[PDB]
Amino acid sequence: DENKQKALAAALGQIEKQFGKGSIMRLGEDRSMDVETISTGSLSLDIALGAGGLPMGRIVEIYGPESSGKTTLTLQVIAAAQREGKTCAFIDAEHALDPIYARKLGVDIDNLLCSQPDTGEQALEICDALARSGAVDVIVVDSVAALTPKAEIEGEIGDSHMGLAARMMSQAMRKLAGNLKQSNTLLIFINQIRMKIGVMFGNPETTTGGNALKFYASVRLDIRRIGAVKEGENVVGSETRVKVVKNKIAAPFKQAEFQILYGEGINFYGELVDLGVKEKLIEKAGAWYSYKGEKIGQGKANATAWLKDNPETAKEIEKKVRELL
Amino acid sequence: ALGAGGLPMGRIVEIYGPESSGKTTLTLQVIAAAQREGKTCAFIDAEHALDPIYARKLGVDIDNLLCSQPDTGEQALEICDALARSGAVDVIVVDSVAALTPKAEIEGEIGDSHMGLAARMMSQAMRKLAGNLKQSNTLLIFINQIRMKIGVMFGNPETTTGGNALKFYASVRLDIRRIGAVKEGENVVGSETRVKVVKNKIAAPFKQAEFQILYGEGINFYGELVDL
Amino acid sequence: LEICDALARSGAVDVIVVDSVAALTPKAEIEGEIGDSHMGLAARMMSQAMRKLAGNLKQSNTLLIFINQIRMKIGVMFGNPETTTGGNALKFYASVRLDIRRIGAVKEGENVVGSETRVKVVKNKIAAPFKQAEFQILYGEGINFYGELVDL
Amino acid sequence: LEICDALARSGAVDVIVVDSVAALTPKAEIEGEIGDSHMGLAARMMSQAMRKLAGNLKQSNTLLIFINQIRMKIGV
Amino acid sequence: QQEVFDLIRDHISQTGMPPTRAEIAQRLGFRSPNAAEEHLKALARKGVIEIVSGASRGIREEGLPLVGRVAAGEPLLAQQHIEGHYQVDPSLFKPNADFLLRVSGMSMKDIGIMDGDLLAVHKTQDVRNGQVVVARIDDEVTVARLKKQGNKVELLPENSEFKPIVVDLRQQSFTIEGLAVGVIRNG
Amino acid sequence: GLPLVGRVAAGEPLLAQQHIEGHYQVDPSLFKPNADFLLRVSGMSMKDIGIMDGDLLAVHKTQDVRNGQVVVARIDDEVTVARLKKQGNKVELLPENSEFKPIVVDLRQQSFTIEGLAVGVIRNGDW
Ligand SMILES: Nc1ncnc2c1ncn2[C@@H]1O[C@H](COP(=O)(O)OP(=O)(O)OP(O)(O)=S)[C@@H](O)[C@H]1O
Ligand SMILES: Nc1ncnc2c1ncn2[C@@H]1O[C@H](COP(=O)(O)OP(=O)(O)OP(O)(O)=S)[C@@H](O)[C@H]1O
Ligand SMILES: [Mg+2]
Ligand SMILES: [Mg+2]
């Protein structure tokens, strides 16, 4: 009935007048809802996340035990962001970042912003300021276990201070989300594990700093160490696994695996070997691997070296793997 | 389970629970079901986290759905007031009560205490929305989040957000949980659910329902048919 | 409140129930926006209504029952933090005040069939105050009289 | 830990050493009796302590060395 | 402590008021109110005492709590959620029961547990071959009879239609959650 | 607590004093119709439905019964647990096991007697 349509148009117009153009519109016409992603620095994890990376404008959480590889993963993410021209920022609340190693991983330290907040409040305030600034594209927070309320710093060891950090996190997310979506900024939180007392059933692990972040997060990643990597009697890397334990973009509960080699970072070409084997582009022959008939080498390390020394074949392999998966 | 066959018209509802439990999927399925009968539906996304393509997979007419992403709680509630007095919209969804934020809080710093403001704003909202919703015959659904209550020695420590008005004004209240996984071989393709009725003004309360949610599809209808 | 007044003045209505003193709203709030401050408007309105209705109610012999709601007093150090909406006027005029509270459940196997309810008399001017009462409300039946009789 | 923080804030001490962490008894455990349950209290204290010391140490440029003991995990 | 609770129970009746924390501490034989405060808090956390604004609100039990599910067949998700209680004596069961679990599947039919039943568990981590136990294998729970040898553990069925489940400790994590002690059925 | 019925001799009700094993405080409201008392059984004859030797079977006492229900009854003044199927003037008590066979004794010679339904099962035996 047209008497309904006239009322509908009148109401929409009045809303738009009071609150401005673009306050309300058909969901099939709003191009700002479309999702956009940036690379995570490993092909396997980008496959695990269905859309091909981390979404812009959302919130992301990463946690694991100690020496898992969180900081190196986030530095590798920053690195790939900057090579496309974007601006980044780092907040080292634990007071432990190392410029030289961050350079070796590939970050450009002459343009990366940094900050070592005295308290958690100013950490979150700096994050809000940067988001409103509209000129920073990636932000990462070193640890939510280092974000002290101002009362704790001025108090004494042993005071209760019960539940303050949870209130801080709740207020922070509640205020930030809109600014981060307007400015098209990606924010990553790192978190440590603790253990619950008194739980009688289930996994007794937990993460620090209240429980609003898990509601407001869009992707949650879990990173753990599973083995050593050796060239002789001396270790040179670590085996890793990643679980996508939450997802608002594609289907959750997938896994990724890769190596982290000290001084270098994530080993990209090992992923090409593994995925070429999976997609039948690389012919496995027992301990020997062959590509299009030719024997490239024996063992994973040898095959990776062969690929490193023969760029064109690695190129075509990477493009085909991208096309299939 | 609901007793009367579904959610009533011209009244307020509240669906809450833990995270990754199925609130958004359920509400989008309600919207999609209503649009096959010719009604007009709207979505207020305060958390800035809706995904349009996935809303098309479940069935929503994305081209005929009104979406608004407000800045503050007051504006978000005033848009609902305008729609309720329009007389043309038949379903409204507010993504979360937690995301609503008084304007005075947006201006302040992150340590500022705005003690008690959100609850008062909500208690005004209900007072103003109750009459118009009935006059216009509009269903309004609130979604909520769970927080723990400190200082409870014994008993249940959970609690929802936003004060106490919504409990008194809500005609139905649904609690939704995830209880298991659904697998094809070694893969995971869905999640088992249990929905409990905790307040009900149109039939007896404290009933239940169990179904499946399959990623990329809606609720599993034929499994419910088999079990029934 | 004008409907209440007119029915009281008609002389032919013997019980009037108002379903929530919280859901009563002044016009200023109705025509305003969400977020404004209309402090004390409802309280003043209710006080006026009370002092206007007191005489008519007795003149025509009608019983007027208000239902209310709970809210929390904020930042209270010691005492009870619960409160009722609508100002302090209604507490003075009331001839009896009742608090009803649910305290348990009625079960048959795995099925909940009803509720167990405490009730208290926190103010009374027809007899002594502070007596309790207890009974069951079973869906579809209301108060269970015969259980009360079996107990008494 | 209070003494540690007090010397860290001063900016005049370059090295602090804590002889053992297995001996840092909480106050509530000191005033109680043997056999009382004090589930997970020293751990909470230690988390608070690290949270409060991490910044003062780097600002003042001091090195803090913790010595620790070994125990067994039952039922592994 | 029980003695502390008794001290309030009789002191309040004898004098009409609860004793002060200093009085309780002095009776306990230590020079600190913390001695009384710790016990008062422990009783309060037990659900026996109420506290408001640092003072006792009063001196004012539901049985075994049903906590989660468990799978007789393939492993099932582990997630604690205390949905309700049941009023039944711990003393009934051989080692004292601690909580209840809901059973799905039919892989223990012969012994006498079946779909939809409640299983009483006694919390512990010391168990030996041949007992009925509950195990978690990478955040999923199962109930079966144990047979441990070397680096592999066998979780056997008690129904000829089901085959045993075997886990290698070098690939998956294995934690024993308790020991089964009985069953309650109400369906 | 609720009384427990152990071994039962003929000529007296199940709840006779010498039949009382003791008191176990189990809330009677847990079961669909209120449980009145408990009764130990040697349940080799009802295995397939999950009843075993040594377990306890809760009973809500009543003489009313319908078809298809599991009932505690007496034949020859002897206690037994079995399901009921009625032909008319004749009625048979049936097992739920793979090796047992029906009971159709003649009422004119020996009549069946009901004491209550079976509402639920509780056990504490060795595993
Ligand atoms: N500057 C470095 N030079 C060589 N190896 C390093 C360096 N920094 C870290 N590593 C190692 O390479 C792996 C990287 O793990 P990390 O990046 O430190 O993750 P992390 O667990 O978040 O760090 P924390 O703050 O100690 S928990 C680990 O094996 C490190 O020991
Ligand atoms: N775009 C998607 N593609 C595939 N699966 C999805 C997608 N979005 C959500 N899911 C999954 O469907 C399940 C329920 O998702 P939701 O309905 O969004 O849950 P929710 O509890 O209402 O929202 P929050 O933010 O977690 S509280 C979850 O397991 C999701 O992982
Ligand atoms: Mg790190
Ligand atoms: Mg949602």
Supply the DSSP symbol for B7: P
Q: Tokens 């809000």 label which residue?
A: A128
Q: How many Å apart are CA A284 and CA E178, to the nearest integer? A: 46
Q: How many Å apart are CA C47 and CA C93, to the nearest integer? A: 10
Nearest to A24 by CA among A40, A33, A13: A13
Q: Do D31 and E34 touch (CB under 8 A)?
A: yes
Give distance in angstroms: CA of A173 to centre of ligand 4. 15
- Tell me the three state secondary structure of residue A14: helix
Q: Tokens 């109750």 label which residue?
A: B130
Instruction: Report the atom number in ligand 1 closest to the C-alpha of A69.
Output: 19
- In terms of C-beta density within 10 A (0-12 exposed, 13-18 middle, 19 or more buried), how is residue B219 classed? middle
A 10 A CB-CB count for C39 gives 8
Q: How many Å apart are CA B171 and CA B175, to the nearest integer? A: 14
Interface mutation vs chain A, best among B86, B96, B184, most A CBs within 10 Å: B86
Q: How many Å apart are CA A38 and CA C135, to the nearest integer? A: 64
| Residues E112 and F50: beta-carbon distance below 8 Å | yes
Q: How many Å apart are CA C132 and CA C124, to the nearest integer? A: 12
Instruction: Report the atom number in ligand 1 closest to the C-alpha of A237.
Output: 29
Q: How far is CA B106 from CA A171, C43, D3, E18, in A?
A: 10, 31, 40, 48
- Chain E touched by F122 (CB under 8 Å): yes
- Using the Cα atoms of residue F88, residue F89, residue F95 and residue F99 in order, give the sign of their dihedral: negative
E67 vs A contacts (CB less than 8 Å): 200-201
Nearest by CB to C23, which of B115, B124, B127? B127
- Tell me the three state secondary structure of residue A180: helix
Supply the DSSP symbol for B41: B
Instruction: Report the atom number in ligand 2 closest to the C-alpha of B47.
Output: 25
Q: H-helix or E-strand containing B135?
A: helix B117-136
Verify whether ligand 2 is closer than 6 Å to residue B52 (CB atom): no
Q: How many Å apart are CA A283 and CA A279, to the nearest integer? A: 10
Q: How far is CA F39 from CA A141, E184, F59, in A?
A: 65, 15, 7
Of B15, B24, B144, the one to substitute when testing ligand 2's pocket (max ligand atoms within 8 A of C-beta) is: B24
Q: Tokens 């738009």 label which residue?
A: A16
- For chain B, list the strands marked E by DSSP: 12-16, 42-44, 66-68, 91-94, 139-143, 146-148, 158-160, 172-184, 187-200, 208-214
Verify whether ligand 2 is closer than 6 Å to residue B63 (CB atom): no
Interface mutation vs chain C, best among B72, B101, B126, B127, most C CBs within 10 Å: B127
Verify whether ligand 2 is closer than 6 Å to residue B54 (CB atom): yes
Q: How many Å apart are CA B220 and CA B228, to the nearest integer? A: 13
Q: How many Å apart are CA B29 and CA B22, to the nearest integer? A: 11
Which residues are F40's β-sheet partners?
A: F56
Three-state SS letters, D28-61: HHHCCCCCCCCCCHHHHHHHHHHHHHHHHHHHHC
Phi/psi region, residue F77 (left: phi>0; alpha: psi -120 to 50; beta: rest), is left
For residue C11, give every residue at least 6 positions away whose Cβ sits within 8 Å of its Cβ, in sequence order, or none: C60
Q: Do A27 and B49 touch (CB under 8 A)?
A: no
Amino acid sitting at position A136: V
DSSP codes, chain C: -HHHHHHHHHT---EEEES-SSS---HHHHHS-TT---TTHHHHHHHHHHHHHHHHHHHHT-EEEE---EEEPTT--SS--EEESS-SHHHHH-SEEEEEEEEEEEEETTEEEEEEEEEEEEEESSS-S--EEEEEEETTTEE-HHHHHHH-
Q: Do B105 and A175 touch (CB under 8 A)?
A: yes
- Chain C touched by E125 (CB under 8 Å): no
Q: Do B164 and C23 touch (CB under 8 A)?
A: no
Q: Is B8 annotated as a binding residue?
A: no
Q: What is the dihedral of CA E61, E64, E67, E73, to 10 degrees?
A: 180
Three-state SS letters, chain E: CHHHHHHHHHHHHHHCCCCCHHHHHHHHCCCCHHHHHHHHHHHHHCCCCEEECCEEEECCCCCEEEEEEEECCCCEECCCCCCEEECCCHHHCCCCCCEEEEEECCCCCCCCCCCCCEEEEECCCCCCCCCEEEEEECCEEEEEEEEEECCEEEEECCCCCCCCEEEECCCCCEEEEEEEEEEEECC
E35 vs D contacts (CB less than 8 Å): 31-32
Q: How many Å apart are CA F125 and CA F40, to the nearest integer? A: 12
| Residues E137 and E167: beta-carbon distance below 8 Å | yes
Q: How far is CA A101 from CA A75, A98, A116, A266, A284, in A?
A: 10, 6, 18, 14, 36
Of B23, B56, B62, B143, the one to substitute when testing ligand 2's pocket (max ligand atoms within 8 A of C-beta) is: B23
Chains F and B touch (3+ CB pairs under 8 A): no
Which residue is closest in CA terms to ligand 2's atom 12? Answer: B215
Q: Is B149 annotated as a binding residue?
A: no
Verify whether ligand 2 is closer than 6 Å to residue A248 (CB atom): yes
Q: What is the dihedral of CA B95, B190, B51, B160, to 10 degrees?
A: 20
| Residues A306 and A295: beta-carbon distance below 8 Å | no
Min Cα–Cα distance to chain F from C109, Å: 4
* Listed resolution, Å: 2.9
Supply the DSSP symbol for F21: E
| Residues C124 and C98: beta-carbon distance below 8 Å | no
- The pair of three-digit structure tokens given for residue E103, joined into one six-digit string: 């059973």
Nearest by CB to F25, which of E86, E89, E185? E89
Give distance in angstroms: CA of A147 to centre of ligand 3. 15
- Tell me the three state secondary structure of residue B111: coil
| Residues A185 and A132: beta-carbon distance below 8 Å | no
Q: How many Å apart are CA C78 and CA F103, to the nearest integer? A: 73
Q: Is B18 annotated as a binding residue?
A: yes
Contacts 24+ apart (CB under 8 A), A122-127: A123/A91, A123/A93, A123/A147, A124/A168, A124/A172, A124/A176, A124/B110, A125/B109, A125/B110, A126/A91, A127/A91, A127/A172, A127/A176, A127/A187
Q: In terms of residues, how long is chain C?
A: 152
Amino acid sitting at position F23: H
Q: How far is CA B74 from CA B140, D50, E85, in A?
A: 17, 41, 42
Q: How many Å apart are CA B108 and CA B119, to the nearest integer? A: 18
Three-state SS letters, A189-200: EEECEEECCCCC
| Residues B119 and B168: beta-carbon distance below 8 Å | no
Nearest to E178 by CA among E56, E51, E53, E80: E80
Nearest to F51 by CA among E109, C139, A296: E109
Rg (CA), chain D: 15
Q: H-helix or E-strand containing B86?
A: helix B73-86
- In terms of C-beta density within 10 A (0-12 exposed, 13-18 middle, 19 or more buried), how is residue A256 classed? buried
Which residue is closest in CA terms to ligand 2's atom 4? Answer: A251
Q: Alpha carbon A268 to chain centroid distance?
A: 17
Q: How many Å apart are CA B175 and CA A255, to the nearest integer? A: 31
Q: In terms of residues, how long is chain F?
A: 127
Q: How many Å apart are CA B211 and CA B22, to the nearest integer? A: 11
Buried b (16+ CB within 10 A) or exposed e, A34-66: ebebbbbbbbbbbbbbeebbbbbbbbbbbbbee
Q: How many Å apart are CA F25 and CA D26, to the nearest integer? A: 43
Q: Which residues of A are annotated as a binding site for ATP?
A: 64-71
Supply the DSSP symbol for A27: G
Q: How many Å apart are CA C66 and CA C24, to the nearest integer? A: 11
Verify whether ligand 2 is closer than 6 Å to residue B193 (CB atom): no
Nearest to B165 by CA among B76, B97, B93: B97
Q: How many Å apart are CA A215 and CA B60, to the nearest integer? A: 24
For residue F106, give every residue at least 6 positions away whose Cβ sits within 8 Å of its Cβ, in sequence order, or none: none
Q: Do B153 and E76 touch (CB under 8 A)?
A: no
Nearest to E158 by CA among E98, E95, E103, E90: E103
Nearest to A120 by CA among A153, A75, A88: A153
Verify whether ligand 1 is closer than 6 Å to residue A15 (CB atom): no
- Tell me the three state secondary structure of residue A233: coil
- The pair of three-digit structure tokens given for residue E21, joined into one six-digit string: 């924390």
Nearest to F18 by CA among F9, F27, F29: F9
Nearest to A96 by CA among A190, A220, A223, A221: A190
Q: Tokens 């069935």 label which residue?
A: B59
Nearest to A89 by CA among A111, A104, A70: A111
- For chain F, list the strands marked E by DSSP: 2-5, 20-24, 37-42, 53-61, 70-75, 78-86, 91-94, 113-123
Chains A and B touch (3+ CB pairs under 8 A): yes
Q: How many Å apart are CA E41 and CA E33, to the nearest integer? A: 12
For residue E115, give every residue at least 6 positions away whose Cβ sits within 8 Å of its Cβ, in sequence order, or none: E103, E104, E105, E106
Give distance in angstroms: CA of A217 to centre of ligand 3. 20
For residue E159, give every residue at least 6 positions away whose Cβ sits within 8 Å of its Cβ, in sequence order, or none: E106, E107, E108, E109, E110
Nearest to F80 by CA among F65, F70, F67, F68: F70
Give distance in angstroms: CA of A109 to centre of ligand 3. 17
Q: How many Å apart are CA A305 and CA A316, to the nearest integer? A: 16
Give distance in angstroms: CA of A294 to centre of ligand 3. 42
Supply the DSSP symbol for B161: S
